[PDB]
């Protein structure tokens, strides 16, 4: 008979000794944020339909209004009609709410508060004095129960904990200046440092953003995506649940580090900033480096979203997790094969940074994301291929033999041996699947050992 | 288990199943508990006369000192004791003073042209592109699909019926700060006329004569939080949940006027939920006052969204609440304040909390709040013990479903949970297709 999964048995089966699975060498430096595609002047700009040379973003939106008025959901892709169209967009805008610029990145600004005293919850509660009584539990092992406890409720699908490796800090932050409003924002963007002092809370000073020492630790969160609306990349329902997950991500941010504050402690929430969320979830056993450069996890392969607070909360580190994802990435390449832009390697990893956007130093498949970000005008999207066609994104891709649970290889075979249909089709609360959600169920056992 | 089998079956024929009588008029919502003269003070357990609110943070510090997670509910240590109470701290960030109340201010605002959001969307100019989408059936399953991306595990759509909407709100003038609007608040006049927009003015809230419908959502509860009532845990829930109402409205409202139409949030403020969720469908009003639903009974938060986009309104429901909460009185018998009557519905009021001319179990919602500061919480013991809170209540006798007649906090934090709190065991319950969408 069929064995019922048991999402947490399987992650004890592929659980790693302590230690960082990231291998480096010496030509390892911490990476300026400016140097990301979305922000890096060489890459920044983009044509859009017409050639006319525009932030890459305002190019998408010119493709986007294109599309509706042409009755498409994506490039060649008719809608049932333009009102159908129209609606993809509605929800994709919608979904964008919490989140400033595309990914919450300026430390310290609107959503991302390194404290929380200025805060209208803050205020409110300020009588009862949480934020200022010391912490009445020190033991790593409570407070881990705590605090994941608090991360499920605050919209986690996942969580780990890891000690704060510097590597993936930014070396500086792209950000605004504390008296930029948010009109102008997007025209006054910054470089910032991000510098660790023996200061005893963090603190941004006009020429630093100042993490202190004692920042031990870093929680890694994610947030699932849903699959239907994923499958339909690189079509605007892709886009919509990317975006809702966004203003998910952020709202995750600020009640978690609400709590933590609550809790007698500090906390630096982040979204996309701050530092590199793939490497905190891998060393935080989320789950493992792809081919692509996502975090594979086991209940959701890549379709899942990252964010990350920072704290000095005593904590009990997770094991990092090895369940053969790099074996796999090594013979499949189908993201690769797929990927509109040829932007995914199918070669081998290196130490090796392929362009500007590539951290140099770490052991990875090495991408060409300037050549990614140019495909997003051209189809109007945040495209997402490459987290669609991913075998592991698909529901059913473990069995279990009667001694123990493996992956089903009949998954990766290659070859294999719409949206209306979306809007029409299944859906559940924030987009999550019911015949999935128990495998994110928690108990006090799994949360802490 | 069938959800949407059960819903189907227990379908009523159009129309409002409120009665009223022709003493009806719309309700003041100065008159709340909450925010009334004769009943916003509270003594402290010192014997110090505050805002109840105020009183209820002194009793929360008491007990967590005390190692306590409740009025004399020990706590394992003074460490739990704390954690449950920056749970439920943490749970308020998205809310502005218990409840989002006051209209246009804040999260709750009636236009999305100042919005983060809305200005960085502005060259795709969905807030101006006019509808392309005018029928009612389309609309209904684009709106309810984007409610549940939005958080909603409930909605339902409503005519809107006025009788619900306060006569006037409780808000703050336009340019007070927030670190002053506690002591700042005023009444302002709901009115509605024919103009293009929701605007407001120096003297009026004002809603247009083209806001047709009411898109209401039910926001679950965690179950074994709630049952933890009246200590920190059941707090904590209802803290969350409030936060996920804030996040909806914002959500739905940017989606509905990127659509093309308009939308105003409301969270607690602008009408009275239960009467909406009531003639929306989501379930029945019931002896303890609030609106039980097939799938979660009364534990489950309510918000709404009013707009002029065309939509077909759902059938009300009826699976025999009234007749049950008839007979029961549990919730009656077990409240700490005996704020809930055990006698029969009337149309007339017990006190000013009370809106009279609809016949209601009528409540005396004073001594409701009084508890509130001598517990430190937001209580929830009426929640916790309705048999319609319970799991499973829904048994099938092979033709058709009916309800089966028969039916500490250290272990919580110990014990299960999943993403906002939700249950996987019953998670399957608020799956949707379009079948039951519209
Ligand atoms: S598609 Fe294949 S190669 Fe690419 S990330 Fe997924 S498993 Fe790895
Ligand atoms: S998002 Fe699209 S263009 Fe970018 S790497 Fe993935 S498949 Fe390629
Ligand atoms: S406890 Fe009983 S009387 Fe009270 S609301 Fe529930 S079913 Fe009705
Ligand atoms: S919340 Fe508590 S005091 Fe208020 S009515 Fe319910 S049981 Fe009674």
Redesign the interface.
Known sequence: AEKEKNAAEIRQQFAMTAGSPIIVNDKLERYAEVRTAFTHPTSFFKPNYKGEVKPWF?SA?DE??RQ?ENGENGPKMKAK???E???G???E??????????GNIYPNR?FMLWSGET???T???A????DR?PP??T?PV?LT??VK??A??????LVGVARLNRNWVYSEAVTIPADVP??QSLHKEIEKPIVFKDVPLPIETDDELIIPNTCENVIVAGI?M?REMMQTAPNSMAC??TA?CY?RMC?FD???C??IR???YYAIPSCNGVGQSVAFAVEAGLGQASRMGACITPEFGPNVRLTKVFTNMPLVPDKPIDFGVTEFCETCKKCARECPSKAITEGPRTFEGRSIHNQSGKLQWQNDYNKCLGYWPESGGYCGVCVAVCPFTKGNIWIHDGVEWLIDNTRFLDPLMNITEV??????????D??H??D?????KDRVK
């Open positions: 305002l939106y986007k209004v509706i009609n333009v009102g169209a129209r609606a967009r509605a929800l805008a919608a979904g964008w709410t919490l989140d400033i610029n595309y609107f805060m209208t919850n205020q409110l509660w009588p009862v004095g949480l009584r009445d539990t033991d409570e129960n705590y406890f608090a499920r409720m605050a919209g986690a699908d948010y009109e699932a849903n919509a649940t809702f203003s709202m600020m009640w978690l609400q709590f609550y809790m007698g809007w029409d089709g299944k859906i559940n609360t924030y987009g999550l019911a015949d959600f128990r994110t169920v928690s108990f006090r």
